[PDB]
Curated annotation (Swiss-Prot), chain C:
The keyword Cytoplasm applies. One of its GO terms (molecular function) is rRNA binding. The gene is RPL9. It comes from the Eukaryota. Component of the large ribosomal subunit. This is Large ribosomal subunit protein uL6. It is found in: Cytoplasm. GO terms for biological process: cytoplasmic translation. The lineage of its organism: Eukaryota, Metazoa, Chordata, Craniata, Vertebrata. Component of the large ribosomal subunit. The ribosome is a large ribonucleoprotein complex responsible for the synthesis of proteins in the cell. Its main location: cytoplasm. InterPro entries: Ribosomal_uL6-like, Ribosomal_uL6-like_a/b-dom_sf, Ribosomal_uL6_a/b-dom, Ribosomal_uL6_CS2.
Amino acid sequence: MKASGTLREYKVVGRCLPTPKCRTPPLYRMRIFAPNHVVAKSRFWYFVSQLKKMKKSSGEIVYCGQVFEKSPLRVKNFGIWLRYDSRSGTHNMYREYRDLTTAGAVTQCYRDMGARHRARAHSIQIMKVEEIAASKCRRPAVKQFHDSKIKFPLPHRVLRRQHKPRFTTKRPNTFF
Amino acid sequence: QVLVLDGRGHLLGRLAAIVAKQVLLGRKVVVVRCEGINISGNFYRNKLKYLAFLRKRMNTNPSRGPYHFRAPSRIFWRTVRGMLPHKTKRGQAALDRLKVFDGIPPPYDKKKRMVVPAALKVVRLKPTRKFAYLGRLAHEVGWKYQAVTATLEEKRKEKAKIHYRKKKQLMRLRKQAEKNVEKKISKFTDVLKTHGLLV
Amino acid sequence: MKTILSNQTVDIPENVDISLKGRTVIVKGPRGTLRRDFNHINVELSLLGKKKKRLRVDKWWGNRKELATVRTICSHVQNMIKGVTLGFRYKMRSVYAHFPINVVIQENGSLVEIRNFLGEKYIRRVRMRPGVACSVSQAQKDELVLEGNDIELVSNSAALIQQATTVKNKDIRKFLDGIYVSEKGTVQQA
Amino acid sequence: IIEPSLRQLAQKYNCDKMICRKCYARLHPRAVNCRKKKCGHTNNLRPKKKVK
RNA sequence: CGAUGCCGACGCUCAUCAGACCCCAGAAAAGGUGUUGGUUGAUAUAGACAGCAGGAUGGUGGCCAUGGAAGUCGGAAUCCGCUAAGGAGUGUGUAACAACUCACCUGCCGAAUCAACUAGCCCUGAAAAUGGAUGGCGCUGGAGCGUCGGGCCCAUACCCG
RNA sequence: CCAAGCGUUCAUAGCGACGUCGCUUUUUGAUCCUUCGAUGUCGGCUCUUCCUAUCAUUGUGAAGCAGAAUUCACCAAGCGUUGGAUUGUUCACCCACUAAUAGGGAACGUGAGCUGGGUUUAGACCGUCGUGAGACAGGUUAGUUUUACCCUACUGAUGAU
Ligand SMILES: [Mg+2]
Ligand SMILES: [Mg+2]
Ligand SMILES: [Mg+2]
Ligand SMILES: [Mg+2]
Ligand SMILES: [Mg+2]
Ligand SMILES: [Mg+2]
Ligand SMILES: [Mg+2]
Ligand SMILES: [Mg+2]
Ligand SMILES: [Mg+2]
Ligand SMILES: [Mg+2]
Ligand SMILES: [Mg+2]
Ligand SMILES: [Mg+2]
Ligand SMILES: [Mg+2]
Ligand SMILES: [Mg+2]
Ligand SMILES: [Mg+2]
Ligand SMILES: [Mg+2]
Ligand SMILES: [Zn+2]
């Protein structure tokens, strides 16, 4: 899986194909964070295969649909439990992020896990995602935004329009 | 016609890349105060970089090159020459459209100097990063005219300060004049405000 | 991790006057003025209050290295306050097993001449920093008193003397001769 | 002969030191890692041996 | 040198040998209180962790082993009393006295602290002969590394003629 | 690199087993990619240059550094690193002086630069081998060392824009 663009949360339901022994096999569900649905179904078969004697040939996808964020206009803290392979082992991690959508927090996770650990998305298995209350957060980087009277300036504002004009008579100002 | 740039506070490589493209497109460029140019990285590691360059010489006849120019103007000139196809007639013609100076000699001393915000150190370097001065670097690899350039740059600035004070004197009069003739120019001032030329 | 805010305050004695010109602190007190430029640190200096005057140093969005400079500025400024009020007095003792170290002060305490160090014929001359005055301590034998308003100048002046009297090509665990800083005090006790 | 108090004053600067085992640097007594990059800031320090 | 002259996104990294793209044209074990991120385990508002006091003895200099080791050098055992506590002992010293410092404990001040592992980038490990090569210049709010967006560039490939 | 030991004590001042990770291409191999319409095959002499894995000297850190002497380590290749007997020798050994008498590369630098002592044609002797002709990383003696006026480089000399 390539963590291309902002990921989406998918609800994927599958089962074993019915057989004479078990005319109605049980249904299984998974939360899949993927770029599109075609990827979402592929990763489902990769996870259920790891947990059950199942695979695409001997099973079917009963339902694939996007799970929309329930409060996209509200700030939340997310706790993400994941395991990943490094160059020399496998590790479990718990990470926290502040976002508006759960799929956004997961996308932050992939970009962050790539930045801080050189982890490609094919080695990362997100186990669990939960919305966490400000009192239950552990990471100091997230907790410092739990401040009802938060305030801070924007020092040394870098000039981003550096080629319009390309040549100018006046030097830029970084204080605003 | 001629694009005059101020070398103070600019990063060597970034300015050269922009200056190299301008002279390839056919524009005449003058860069002044090449000793004011900056290089990212602490001074010592930039000094080492040039001392390694000084070691490059034809073992059998050092007079045959490379030539290691010690002036900040020539160091910058050779940097721009490194971003041009200077072994073709096109590249050499472009290289002739660039003039490089230490300090600001005439006639550029009495002309407005442009900057290149894409090459400005304040724009391109995080404020915590160390940087080097091309003038100090050049002086410490054999440049002989650091003190004289500074002495003459101190005389120019004293003259520039006098010129500015005269300009401020003339602007104070201008604002006073706009007040004395406020009634005679009111109709023309509404035309400008109507069309944004005066806020 | 970048921390939103990190600040530390310094309390200014009523007899000290602190003024800011950007990141330049000017501490004026009974013993004179000190000026230090902190333009190399991206902090924000403020003066708070009018009766009990304080100096605040703020660092927004700093990393671990940047945060460590907030208290460094505060300590420097306190030393400047300590300098313009109490002064700095560095006492140095001359240690010798056989050959006395004869020290002669010259130029009103701005030049220290050291003779007979481990018996050497060479004469050592150490130039104190501006604003620092050396003198032989009248209270004790083999003791120099360096006084000044700037800790960096005064404590750097003592370092020059201590390194001037360095033993060479010997076992310095045995040849302990030298002039060493023995106490870091203030000119006026209070 | 040096007075015992002045012996301790000189010894504070000449003997009470740690020694980096990898690069021989002179370090303050409470040092836990060397200050030199040449050894990679190693924690293999030892006391400066006392003169007998 | 054709095309990012995008108001590209989030991080990581400072190198007094930085890094920079299949084959491929250079590096290992082992290390770092550089920096970042994680795992586990402790202790702290009954107020923790530094910083600022005392304590080296009561049975006892425990008996063995000693030319001689009293707590202090080895070999198996390694108890109590008074108490805020006190190892029948952490370090100090000879050929023996002699000697002091920690385990401990409370006086103080008032928010996080400590330990061990683990993995990223950087660093040490890292020495060759003509002067020298991420292709070069150069580049550090990146023109480096990881994960990702739009856009654009051009083969004799693909489409229409 | 680990650290069992050594070092009276004490792993790591200085060493370091059992193990293990590397670097170099001044050793020998392994291979047979280039050269058999020919790239002159050892050593010395002469001459310049470069490397550092530093013997000496400058500035330093550590010792089981009292001094003297010495040993370990750092920045470091600027300047030095010699005269001789035996041998073709490289290598070696000794004598003598020295601050020191370090180690190497440049087509195992250098034969249109020399020399030709050795190796490696044709003569000849000895030993072993062969019936013999003959052979021998076995000894011995005698055995032709060609050309620059071309291009470049270099050294100097006129000069040219
Ligand atoms: Mg010269
Ligand atoms: Mg000595
Ligand atoms: Mg290209
Ligand atoms: Mg067609
Ligand atoms: Mg032992
Ligand atoms: Mg073959
Ligand atoms: Mg041929
Ligand atoms: Mg030839
Ligand atoms: Mg030939
Ligand atoms: Mg070296
Ligand atoms: Mg040869
Ligand atoms: Mg030849
Ligand atoms: Mg020949
Ligand atoms: Mg011959
Ligand atoms: Mg013959
Ligand atoms: Mg026979
Ligand atoms: Zn060290």
